[PDB]
Each structure stands twice: as C-alpha cells, then as structure tokens.
C-alpha cells in the first residue's frame, strides 16, 4: 500500500485546477476593437468610401 502514501490528487487534477480557464490573449482586445472601429471609420468619417452622411442627412442640390 505504498500508493496510499502518494498524494491522492492526480497530476491531472492539479493541471485542471491550476489552469482552469484559458487565459485572455493580450492582442484579443486589439483585434476585436479594431475590427469594430473599422466600422466606426467606415460609416462616420467623411473620407471613407461608404459614409452614412449622404444617406442620413441627404443633400441640398
């Protein structure tokens, strides 16, 4: 019964309790806000090719 003197908690159960959640990448906040601000650039810039300014406040010709 030498196995009953070993620590009963496995090496697996350490690695699943220590690394419980996959950690958040540092660049995940950049490349998710950049792709969402590329839609703020597109719609709202006045130099974008797809601006909303001509379909929101139309024109007066």
């Amino acid at each position: 019964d030498r196995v009953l003197s070993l620590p009963a908690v496995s090496k697996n159960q350490v690695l699943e309790n220590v690394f419980h959640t996959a950690p958040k990448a540092p660049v995940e906040h950049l490349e998710k806000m950049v792709s969402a601000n590329s839609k703020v650039y597109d719609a709202l810039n006045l130099q974008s090719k797809r601006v909303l300014i001509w379909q929101v406040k139309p024109a007066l010709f």
Partner: protein, 81 residues
C-alpha cells in the same frame, strides 16, 4: 416663393456679422458697390437696385438628393442618433 418678391437694397444687410467674411456695401443713389472679403479672396462688384429685383425672377427651388427617400433618411438619421 411667390411670383413677385419685393425685397432688395432697401433695409438690406449692410455689413456682415461674423469675422469669417467681411461685407461692405456702398449705398449710392442708383447702384451699390459691394465689397465682399472671404479668406484670402476679395470681390468688389456693383449691384443695382433693379439688379437684385431680377434675382428672384427665376427660383432656385432646392431639393434633396436622398439615397432612398427624404422620409427614410430622416428615420435612419434618428436611428443613427
């Protein structure tokens, strides 16, 4: 507008109210020399009392170029706001 309008060179604005553009008129008896200064450019022409009355003979009648319609663009401007 109507067909006949009755304004021009009588109780007119004689000077601009902002600094971005400078306006001066030379109220003579028959005509008036305007002095317009906007940025680097200056214009100084002469407008008669009967030259402004022919201005409202042809109407401009501005109208909006909308992507879909003026109604739709006013709803979409509110959804954007």
């Amino acid at each position: 507008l109507t067909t006949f309008t009755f304004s021009g060179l009588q109780d007119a604005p004689v000077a601009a109210l902002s600094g971005s553009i400078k306006l001066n008129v030379a109220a003579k008896a028959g005509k008036a020399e305007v002095t317009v200064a906007a940025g680097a450019a200056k214009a100084a022409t002469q407008v008669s009392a009967a030259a402004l009355r022919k201005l409202s003979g042809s109407k401009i009648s501005l109208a909006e170029v909308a992507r879909i319609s003026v109604l739709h663009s006013s709803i979409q401007n509110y959804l954007l706001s």
